[PDB]
Write a protein that binds this DNA or RNA. Structure first.
Ligand SMILES: [Mg+2]
Ligand SMILES: [Mg+2]
Ligand SMILES: [Mg+2]
Ligand SMILES: [Mg+2]
Ligand SMILES: [Mg+2]
Ligand SMILES: [Mg+2]
Ligand SMILES: [Mg+2]
Ligand SMILES: [Mg+2]
Ligand SMILES: [Mg+2]
Ligand SMILES: [Mg+2]
Ligand SMILES: [Mg+2]
Ligand SMILES: [Mg+2]
Ligand SMILES: [Mg+2]
Ligand SMILES: [Mg+2]
Ligand SMILES: [Mg+2]
Ligand SMILES: [Mg+2]
Ligand SMILES: [Mg+2]
Ligand SMILES: [Mg+2]
Ligand SMILES: [Mg+2]
Ligand SMILES: [Mg+2]
Ligand SMILES: [Mg+2]
Ligand SMILES: [Mg+2]
Ligand SMILES: [Mg+2]
Ligand SMILES: [Mg+2]
Ligand SMILES: [Mg+2]
Ligand SMILES: [Mg+2]
Ligand SMILES: [Mg+2]
Ligand SMILES: [Mg+2]
Ligand SMILES: [Mg+2]
Ligand SMILES: [Mg+2]
Ligand SMILES: [Mg+2]
Ligand SMILES: [Mg+2]
Ligand SMILES: [Mg+2]
Ligand SMILES: [Mg+2]
Ligand SMILES: [Mg+2]
Lengths: 57, 117, 113, 127
RNA sequence: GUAGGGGAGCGUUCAGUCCGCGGAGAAGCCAUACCGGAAGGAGUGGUGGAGCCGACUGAAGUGCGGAUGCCGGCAUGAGUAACGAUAAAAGAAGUGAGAAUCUUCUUCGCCGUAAGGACAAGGGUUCCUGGGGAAGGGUCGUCCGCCCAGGGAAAGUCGG
RNA sequence: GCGAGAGCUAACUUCCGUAGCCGAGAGGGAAACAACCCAGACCAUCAGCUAAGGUCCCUAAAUGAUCGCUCAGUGGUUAA
RNA sequence: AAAGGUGAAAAGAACCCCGGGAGGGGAGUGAAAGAGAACCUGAAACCGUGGACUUACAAGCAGUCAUGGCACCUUAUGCG
């Protein structure tokens, strides 16, 4: 029992591994009213608009 | 009095390390593995001075054989041909004639097959 | 695998006390804020309970009363809201995505009538 | 200029569109994950993306972004509608260290790392 | 050419003497394609901000990659395992720079010879009020048994 | 390797005699390979000759010459 | 046990900008803030940003030799 790594992993390796941790930036749209930005199919967090006006102020 | 290391070890170290640029990974950044890599490098340097002298001869010979055979002659027969007619050329030079100057190499060929007759 | 419903990392009793509490709450106050999922999972339980209350007879009250243990809310859903929904073939609710919370990263949401 | 000292009197170094959050109690690789989205991007964008990125780090980084903005506008009279994140990076603060118990007698050391976030705003014309 | 013997030297501190530099900038640090047969040594430039090179002579705590060596810092494993009983949570409301975690309301769930209450031993201000939020809290905290301040403990009859 | 014992005229065996090598020996050859074959490296060279071993292509060098042999891939691992 | 060092002198940064703060950018002081109180120098491991040339048919103690390509020109137009 008790596996353990045989050898330090190179800085190079370690970083090759990390080639996939890129965050994915939001696709962001600009609210058709109050004008800041929002997520598709969410309520625009600036005004509160989702066609008329749902969340409060 | 006491005498610390002060300054010497780091100078040695940087010496090795600075010999070692362009070495892959730790081989160029860690002292010990640098110094080590370098021992093996020693072997390779000395050896290959002799050995490159071995290698270039080879190359010349290849080219010579080629030219020889363009005009219907083997190399070996071409070289006894040259020694017979007491033409005394470097094979470095023979190669360069063979590669660079067609007609001239041709002339040496005819001279040599004459020396063979 | 056509199975249906959500485990919601809970035991059968919990799962039930959930849908009942959140039903009682949505009916107590027209709209509530909750995990997007718990919403998804709440919509059809409450919508149905509405359709039950839409019967008006005493049976349908006692029925609703098993799932909804607060008198005042029962009375509300029997006498006030079911009669309003009178003409709508279901779809008594809807869901809105508000979005990500700070503590635990979770898309909240809004569910209402 | 004739003397180093002469220059040190005459010039004084400026840090044009630059702010730095020092000793942010976070981990660099984390904070970077956020930052790499911000970088190269036109300040407005950055301001938004930071509001919809759902990492913690997103917030300290928002704050430095604004500090660099208020340093390029105020202390440097630059042009908002032309600002972009010319550069941004994270380096390691002095990392907090604490003992934590483990099974049987063994103990361990958690590294609560810290962070230096740095943003550098700068105007962008194409010509 | 291994153990080993022999020979000529390189570099380090301190010491004596000689030379002599140094705010128009020393030692140290950094880069470098030059020099010497090697230890090594100079040239220029960047750093630095107050001491120091060369020569001869003397004395050593005098030269490191190893010792599962010692002290220290930082890597790998890795954004991995884990977040400490499977008694369980939901909504509203409030607060707040910021709330899944704090406060209130309504419910839900779990203990109930206990997971309730009262002493002793031990601990030592942890109690109450008002404030705070770096770290401590395995998340978060506006909260706390944490931090700051001020209050609080009363015996002829209980115990000595 | 040669000379013997021990051993099964076994052992990358054991114990002696003797020569050489490795040990403390780099260089070419034997695919690879302390030991075998050639050969003892003061340094520099993009110069010439040779040793063992080689000259179809990988791979430097005659797909050489002449008289034969084997046709079995013998070549490229054993015997009555 | 570990622990040391602003500056000649505290003149220890009024005031303005982003931030709850932390932190920072200005200004002002200073010879120097390339000395700001996590304050002399500030090496190496180790973590990053940017640029040069590069790498997605490849078997590798990572070197060494030879050549070609690109790039560069402060002991540098060659021995690079
Ligand atoms: Mg030779
Ligand atoms: Mg879970
Ligand atoms: Mg010798
Ligand atoms: Mg002296
Ligand atoms: Mg000294
Ligand atoms: Mg060591
Ligand atoms: Mg060990
Ligand atoms: Mg250690
Ligand atoms: Mg992960
Ligand atoms: Mg793993
Ligand atoms: Mg896993
Ligand atoms: Mg897990
Ligand atoms: Mg727990
Ligand atoms: Mg659970
Ligand atoms: Mg408010
Ligand atoms: Mg909880
Ligand atoms: Mg209330
Ligand atoms: Mg109790
Ligand atoms: Mg007491
Ligand atoms: Mg915490
Ligand atoms: Mg407050
Ligand atoms: Mg208390
Ligand atoms: Mg009394
Ligand atoms: Mg034997
Ligand atoms: Mg040999
Ligand atoms: Mg050999
Ligand atoms: Mg070979
Ligand atoms: Mg052998
Ligand atoms: Mg021969
Ligand atoms: Mg050939
Ligand atoms: Mg401040
Ligand atoms: Mg001034
Ligand atoms: Mg790069
Ligand atoms: Mg292929
Ligand atoms: Mg390719």
């Amino acid at each position: 029992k008790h596996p353990v790594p045989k050898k330090k992993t190179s800085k190079s390796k370690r970083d090759m591994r990390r080639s996939h941790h890129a965050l994915t930036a939001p696709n962001l749209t600009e609210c058709p009213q109050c004008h800041g930005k929002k997520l598709s199919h969410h309520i625009c967090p600036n005004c509160g608009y989702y066609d008329g006006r749902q969340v409060l102020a | 009095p006491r005498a610390k290391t002060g300054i010497v070890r780091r100078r040695r170290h940087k010496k090795v390390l600075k010999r070692a640029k362009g070495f892959w990974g730790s081989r160029s950044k860690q002292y010990r593995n640098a110094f080590q890599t370098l021992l093996n490098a020693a072997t390779y340097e000395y050896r290959d001075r002799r050995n490159k002298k071995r290698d270039f001869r080879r190359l010349w010979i290849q080219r010579i054989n080629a030219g020889a055979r363009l005009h219907g002659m083997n190399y070996s027969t071409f070289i006894n041909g040259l020694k017979r007619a007491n033409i005394d050329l470097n094979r470095k030079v023979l190669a360069d004639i063979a590669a660079r100057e067609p007609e001239a190499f041709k002339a040496l060929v005819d001279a040599s097959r004459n020396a063979r007759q | 695998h056509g199975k249906a419903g959500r485990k919601l990392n809970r035991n059968s009793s919990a799962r039930v006390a959930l849908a009942r509490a959140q039903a009682t709450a949505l009916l107590r106050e027209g709209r509530i804020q909750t995990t997007l999922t718990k919403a998804k999972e709440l919509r059809p339980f409450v919508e149905q309970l509405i359709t039950t209350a839409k019967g008006g007879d005493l049976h349908s009250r006692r029925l609703v009363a098993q799932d909804i243990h607060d008198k005042d809310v029962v009375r509300k859903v029997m006498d006030e809201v079911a009669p309003k929904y009178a003409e709508r073939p279901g779809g008594y609710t809807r869901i809105l995505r508000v979005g990500t919370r700070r503590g635990d990263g979770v898309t909240m949401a809004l569910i209402e009538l | 200029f004739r003397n180093k000292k002469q220059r040190k009197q005459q010039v004084k170094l400026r840090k044009p569109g630059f702010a730095v959050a020092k000793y942010v109690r976070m981990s660099p690789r984390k904070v970077r994950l956020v930052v790499d989205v911000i970088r190269g991007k036109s300040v407005q964008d950055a301001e938004d993306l930071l509001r919809f990125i759902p990492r913690s780090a997103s917030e300290p980084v928002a704050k430095v972004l604004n500090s660099a903005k208020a340093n390029a506008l105020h202390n440097d009279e630059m042009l908002e509608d032309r600002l972009f994140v010319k550069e941004a990076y994270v380096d390691a603060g002095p990392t907090l260290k604490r003992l934590i118990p483990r099974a049987r007698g063994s103990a361990n050391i958690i590294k609560k790392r810290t962070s230096h976030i740095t943003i550098i705003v700068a105007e962008k014309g194409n010509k």
